[PDB]
């Protein structure tokens, strides 16, 4: 029955060993969190990712994978730049990431409608309704300048701004002009309308204000990951 002896030897030597290795690697796998990044070509996403990596890439001419660490919890961030413009298919590979980073160029009012449509599509997508999205607005300082010059006024693409009023939730920054805050939070509400009107409790969108030079974005992503996981735990541990 040497065949049985060989089978037993092969099984014991191979499966035990490689499954011990596999558990060792799973321990590492769970501890690492993975995040998808999105944004327009003129957005600062590349600069943002470079700043985070400097704060501390695994590939080029393709997926621009990146590593970073905060509070001794290791993170991965992935930027898909090696693909053509159509997104509707390869996007759903990230249905299980903790969150999706979404960056918009608010100064470029022409794309604001394009970014709004893209955000609508992401929010209502069948395979992304459960994946929280983090919203990033950039080139904010240029908004006041655009208001002064008015080369393409806000009303030209969103006349709702004229009838719009600053909300009570408004918290104008110490050195910031008020009407600029009005317009800025106005575009914020433009996107949050899409966020909330058809949204559900199984989803959320976290708005944030920043320019690419800001390093805190890593900690913001980390804290919002904490919040997301905390709610998934509330659901998992039967507190809901």
């Amino acid at each position: 029955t040497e065949d049985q002896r060989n089978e037993e030897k092969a099984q014991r030597e191979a499966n035990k060993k490689i499954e011990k290795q596999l558990q060792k690697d799973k321990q590492v796998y769970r501890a690492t969190h993975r995040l998808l990044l999105l944004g327009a070509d003129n957005s600062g996403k590349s600069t943002i990712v470079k700043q985070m990596r400097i704060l501390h890439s695994g590939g080029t001419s393709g997926i621009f994978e990146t590593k970073f660490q905060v509070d001794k919890v290791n993170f991965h961030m992935f930027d898909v730049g090696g693909q053509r413009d159509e997104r509707r298919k390869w996007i759903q590979c990230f249905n299980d990431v903790t969150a999706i980073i979404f960056v918009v160029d608010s100064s470029d009012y022409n794309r604001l409608q394009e970014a709004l449509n893209l955000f609508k599509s992401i929010w209502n997508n069948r395979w992304l309704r459960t994946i929280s999205v983090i919203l990033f607005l950039n080139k904010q300082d240029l908004l006041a300048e655009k208001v002064l010059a008015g080369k393409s006024k806000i009303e030209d693409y969103f006349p709702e701004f004229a009838r719009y009023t600053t909300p009570e939730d408004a918290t104008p920054e110490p050195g910031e002009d008020p009407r600029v805050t009005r317009a800025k939070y106005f575009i914020r509400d433009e996107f949050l309308r899409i966020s909330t009107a058809s949204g559900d409790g199984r989803h959320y969108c976290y708005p944030h204000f920043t320019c690419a030079v800001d390093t805190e974005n890593a900690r913001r992503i980390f804290n919002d990951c904490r919040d997301i996981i905390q709610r998934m735990h509330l659901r998992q541990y039967e507190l809901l």
Partner: peptide, 8 residues
């Protein structure tokens, strides 16, 4: 045939 891993 034996639901076993042989490589990883």
């Amino acid at each position: 045939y034996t639901t076993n891993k042989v490589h990883a």
